[PDB]
From a paper:
Carbonic anhydrases (CAs, EC 4.2.1.1) are metalloenzymes, which catalyze the reversible hydration of carbon dioxide. In order to learn more about the molecular mechanism of β-CA, we have determined the crystal structure of β-CA from Coccomyxa (Co-CA) in complex with five inhibitors: acetazolamide, thiocyanate, azide, iodide, and phosphate ions. Co-CA is a homo-tetrameric structure with one dimer present in the asymmetric unit. The catalytic zinc ion binds to the side chains of residues Cys-47, His-103, and Cys-106 in a tetrahedral geometry with the fourth ligand expected to be a water molecule in the native enzyme.
Azide and thiocyanate ions in the active site of Co-CA were clearly defined in the 2.3 Å and 2.5 Å electron density maps, respectively. For SCN- the nitrogen atom is also positioned 2.0 Å from the zinc ion, and makes a comparable, but weaker, hydrogen bond to the amide group of Gly-107 (3.4 Å). The geometry of the zinc is tetrahedral — the four substituent atoms binding to the zinc ion in Co-CA-SCN have bond angles between 100° and 120°. There is a water molecule bridging the Asp-49 Oδ2 atom and the NH atom of Gly-107 in the SCN- inhibited structure. In Co-CA, thiocyanate binds tetrahedrally to the zinc ion analogous to acetazolamide, azide and water (this work and). The orientation of the thiocyanate ion in the Mt-CA structure and in the Co-CA-SCN structure reported here is not identical. In Mt-CA, the sulphur atom of the inhibitor is positioned in the vicinity of Ala-75, i.e. the residue homologous to Val-71 in Co-CA. The sulphur atom in Co-CA-SCN is however directed towards Tyr-88′. For Co-CA-IOD and Co-CA-SCN, iodide and thiocyanate ions, respectively, substituted the chloride ions at the interface. The histidine side-chain has two conformations: an "in" conformation in Co-CA-SCN in which the side chain is directed towards the active site area, two conformations in Co-CA-AZM and Co-CA-PO4 (monomer B only, in monomer A it is "in"), and an "out" conformation in the structures of Co-CA-AZI, and Co-CA-IOD.
Numbering used by the authors:
A (entry chain A), B (entry chain B), C (entry chain B), D (entry chain A): 6 to 227
Amino acid sequence: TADLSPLLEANRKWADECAAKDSTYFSKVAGSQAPEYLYIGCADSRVSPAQLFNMAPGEVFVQRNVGNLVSNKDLNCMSCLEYTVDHLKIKHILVCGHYNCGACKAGLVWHPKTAGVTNLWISDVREVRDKNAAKLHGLSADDAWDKMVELNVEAQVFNVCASPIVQAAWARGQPLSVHGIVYTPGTGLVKELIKPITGMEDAGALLRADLKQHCFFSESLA
Amino acid sequence: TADLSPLLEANRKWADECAAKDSTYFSKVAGSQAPEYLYIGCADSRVSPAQLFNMAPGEVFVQRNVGNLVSNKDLNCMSCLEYTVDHLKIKHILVCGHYNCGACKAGLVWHPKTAGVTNLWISDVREVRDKNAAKLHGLSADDAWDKMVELNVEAQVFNVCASPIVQAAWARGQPLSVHGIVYTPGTGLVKELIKPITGMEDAGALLRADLKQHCFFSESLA
Amino acid sequence: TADLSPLLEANRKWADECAAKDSTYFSKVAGSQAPEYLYIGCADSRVSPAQLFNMAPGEVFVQRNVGNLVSNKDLNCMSCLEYTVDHLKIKHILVCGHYNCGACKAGLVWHPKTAGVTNLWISDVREVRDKNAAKLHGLSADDAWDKMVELNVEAQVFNVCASPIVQAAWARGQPLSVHGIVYTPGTGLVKELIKPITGMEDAGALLRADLKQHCFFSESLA
Amino acid sequence: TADLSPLLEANRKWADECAAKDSTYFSKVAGSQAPEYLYIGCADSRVSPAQLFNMAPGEVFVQRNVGNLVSNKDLNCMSCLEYTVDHLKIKHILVCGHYNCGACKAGLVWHPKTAGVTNLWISDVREVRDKNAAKLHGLSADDAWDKMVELNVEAQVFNVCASPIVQAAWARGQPLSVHGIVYTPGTGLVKELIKPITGMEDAGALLRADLKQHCFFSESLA
Ligand SMILES: [Zn+2]
Ligand SMILES: [Zn+2]
Ligand SMILES: [Zn+2]
Ligand SMILES: [Zn+2]
């Protein structure tokens, strides 16, 4: 019962359906790729980018990790961002959270003495949490969970915008836009939490934290 | 223009159908997930695992990084592995490489002096190449590329097998299998490179590196 | 010339003396170590902990990195912390910053777009600065630098306190203290910035961030 | 007894002795540093660089970690190397192992199912180990341990030489030399395992592995 035959038969059928309808569906992407989109999202099994957006092969380059986290000192995620931006010249970066996310739950409730690598990994969710005690405390377990997801989404858009890669791209006039969205596993629909950000002006109007003070910090000293 | 209306409209259209076909498609995965698979794959825009295996929401938990790499020392990949194995209790790990992989070509032709984070990330790929330098010795460019891909899939499978998370599940008598697969962007077809590995003895029959030696080295001293 | 003879000659001279003073200086630490201290400090060439505390061989176990930084997600620092606490059974952790620290100045004046790995590594330093933006607001260059150093020492001490290794030793009733110190390259003098922390209650009295909140957040939901 | 008074009194006395003998000992390094040496070595409490070499403040910038490891995807160690080479323009890099090293022991004998971050961290020692089964198997526990230390030293010189930083420096004609040495805790003496390496020619003559094939790999393809 460790056998893959059923699973290989599903893939075979799918590939045949696809090319029967469009002969160059796969052929036209045999030898290179040029997607317009990068998507950064959760490793959760209910949130499948290509299928929920209906995008075909060669349309969306994807990073996927527990909690949809972005950090300058994570060479895994930073690699997806640098390769898309600097070598494929993508136009749009999608940063996506989901309701009912258990990486955000563990962030609310786990004691940091918890054994294992997952507890190390979701340290980033604790940091967003600890900054928003005023939006979180004394809500129902349910209302706190949905609000944790939204805040993290906002946290990770800022991280993408404040990243060295995306900062160098905007400095050399490359058009690049960043987007904060959220998915509902219960209904399969996407909602837009934050409108499009295409540079320092949009960022300055749409994000809670101050990206400009972040980038130019000694223009606030003496 | 970075307008999202077109993408959202495609998600609308997508959700309505899936539901009209089947009323409970989404609502039954409202409040939890219990997938049976973990997929570790490449970040490239042509290899979409839920799409290419035709899997419904909540069927396959996903890690996706430049080059489908697995190291004990990468907390991003290691948490995907710990969460599925230890808490979700999955049964099958899919380790997937792909033909035409730009990460594997970078591993053959870049000089380690190249700037930027992607050059750091693919060091694992240079190490597989060096240990196997002789196998890649007189091949045409295309032939070294296809070989690199396949050698990388075998290594990554040994890495999952040798990981502390996995050695631990085996010693506890957890049922958990590991499978080396490859994908062709040009055809949409999955091929199987290494048959199922369900414990230490399959790993002895199937892998070219010695998993027993790695696990029990110190016994071969006096 | 890269000849090593001069350096080796200085080690010869050094060893002979220490031994002539005291026959068993070296031979008694031939086959094990049991130090009582762990030092986490900066990599800068002026801050040499065994020298500046005048400690003999086997007295102080050392971590040294650009900016004396501590994150749950850095396996280099975290193993120094786990090995001493869990296996060597140490009693005191020294977390040491220094005046004139180029890492702390880089954290104030670099634009996150700057190339190279040192710019990634010091993100922890930008985050301490941002949370405390107001305290650093109208200071002269020298004054913001000295403040940055001191704020960084407090943060890093909270990081060691909040780590899973340390929370775990405390819950097991292990005696283990944590101490925030600073060093002046110009004088050779150590000053003490935060008094000893020996458990949860000292941490409540001594740190400006709330360690209890961080550990038990989820209790303040309904 | 968690009290630091005795320890602060030792530092005070030391600093006074030093400046009594030489008035500018500390003063001349109050406002910057310019060391000639970087040292990369073990966090072991018996191996204290500044004291074993008799170097004063401002002479040796130091990285220290469990096992004296160097990896392109360790931002901690890679930071020490990039800062010294590119901003301070050091001339000499010292890579140092020690006999009786317990990071190298754990590498010989631990089962990789072992819980904790230290076991993740010393994965690099397993990789050097697995490549040298022919130098290691059927030696006494003691003889295998000393040989593990020597090999690792060689492993980590190669890693320094093959690093992006040191590769870019040599390409722009910066003089920089790499040195493989070993210390004996039992006798306090240093020994030279590998003679000085100042570029690709020296590396090519003195190192077991092929640095040239490593850097220029497609000049061995067709
Ligand atoms: Zn999630
Ligand atoms: Zn690929
Ligand atoms: Zn410093
Ligand atoms: Zn050691």
